[PDB]
Symmetry: C2
């Protein structure tokens, strides 16, 4: 999740947040993070919880 | 210039910081606050100097 946040930082930094994208992740502490400005990008994304 | 900074904050915020866009800016002194996170997305733009 730490390195997930790192990926999200880098993919903003490369600008790889496009509405084309829909992506696949593993660890499930995903909701808890500092997350807010990302959802304003048109990208499709989905998570998992139990 | 301040409104330019607001513009680019909004444009990265929507994800209109795309490599597809090739743009033109009238003023000159945009460099004071950083453009380096805005640099490495692959975008296209130009300005002027005198």
């Amino acid at each position: 999740h730490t390195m997930a946040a790192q990926i999200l930082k880098q993919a903003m930094a490369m600008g790889m947040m496009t509405e084309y994208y829909h992506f696949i992740f593993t660890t499930l502490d995903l909701y808890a993070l500092d997350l807010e400005p990302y959802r304003y990008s048109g990208v499709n994304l989905t998570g998992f919880r139990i």
